[PDB]
Amino acid sequence: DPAKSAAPYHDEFPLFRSANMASPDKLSTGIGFHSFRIPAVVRTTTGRILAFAEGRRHTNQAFGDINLVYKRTKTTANNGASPSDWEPLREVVGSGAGTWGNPTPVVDDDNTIYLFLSWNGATYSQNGKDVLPDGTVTKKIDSTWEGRRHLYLTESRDDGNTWSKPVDLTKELTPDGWAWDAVGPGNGIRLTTGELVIPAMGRNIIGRGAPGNRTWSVQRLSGAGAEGTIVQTPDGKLYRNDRPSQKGYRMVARGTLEGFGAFAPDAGLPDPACQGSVLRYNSDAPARTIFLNSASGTSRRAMRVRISYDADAKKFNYGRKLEDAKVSGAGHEGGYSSMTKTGDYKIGALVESDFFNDGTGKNSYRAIIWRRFNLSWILNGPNN
Ligand SMILES: [Cl-]
Ligand code: NA
DSSP: OOOGOOOOOOEEEEEEEOSSSOOOOTTSSSOOSSSSEEEEEEOTTTTTEEEEEEEEESSSSSSSSEEEEEBBOOOOOOOSSSSSBBBOOOEOOOOSSSSSEEEEEEEEEOEEEEEEEEEEOOTTSSSSOOOOTOBBBBBBBBBBBBOOOEEEEEEESHHHHSSOOOEEOOOHHHTTOSSSOOBBOOOOOOOSSOEEEEETTTTTEEESSSSTOOEEEEEOOOOOOSSEEEOTTTTTOOEEOOOSSEEEEEEEEEEEEEEEOOOEEEEEESSOOOOEEEEEEEESSSEEEEEEEEEEEOOOEEEEEEEEEETTOOOHHHHHHHHGOOOSSSSSEEEEEEEETTTTEEEEEEEEEEEOTTSSSOOOOEEEEEEEEEEHHHHHHHHH
């Protein structure tokens, strides 16, 4: 791999700064956020980078008032290299006091940026009986229109500058009778053959036809997770790499738009039951797929980026621990992640971090780190 011979490069800094940090990220309206969680990042066809997160208003919890926030690079060419390269915090959607989340973007050929999102009402939570800031007790998410998880789509036609009011696609793209649902979170993909594939709970969402004017359909999957990732491997096949229901290992299945085989644990990819991210890097020799998760059966604080050279991504290398290039002052790094290629031949990664000031409790501030590193940096890691 010629990349190992390049000068290794890394830089990293907080991109979404929680309420407890100096210069916390707030909207121009003055609306602030206790925590930022659930990152998603894409590079547009112009080279601009768009970073999305859930703005969790009052606590770090997944229910209650949560808005979908974002930042863009100020120009199409700066590659988000330094803090001053990034615009201030903006909002995709924040209507009501319910939950707008699970950002799952994909960039189409015409530069339409699609962003699939999950939604639930202000008074509902996955488990039910959770206490809201005002003392209200939530109802459990159920199969009713009011109480179920919805699937929404918004898009941008101006390189992420503005977003449409999200359109509810639940009846079209979520099976009837479902209560809980999730899309991504992280990213969808565009195949060599032209289709879009967006990973979701128990299914893929497939986009066909004209870029930025797609016809959507559902590909049901057997044994898929709630939080899935998708990549097209060097062989042109599809690859689902999903969060397991119980701690242990990533669950992997391979297939095509005609169907997938069975999901099975990948023993080379330990996972503590957490979201992960995957990225198609290049198809020419040597072809590479990149993977990022917490490489541990128990902890989210073992973030590891890896490379596979396999046509079907059978095996990933040890890779490199992100702690080799640690960030100070932004809490304990580790959790959900998202990766993009940059325009200057780097990998850009968003990674959750937890101050843990309230332990596992709701008041522990959560921030999001932005990393840039090249293949050389990964390959020159001391553990492989
Ligand atoms: Cl198509
Ligand atoms: Na809101």
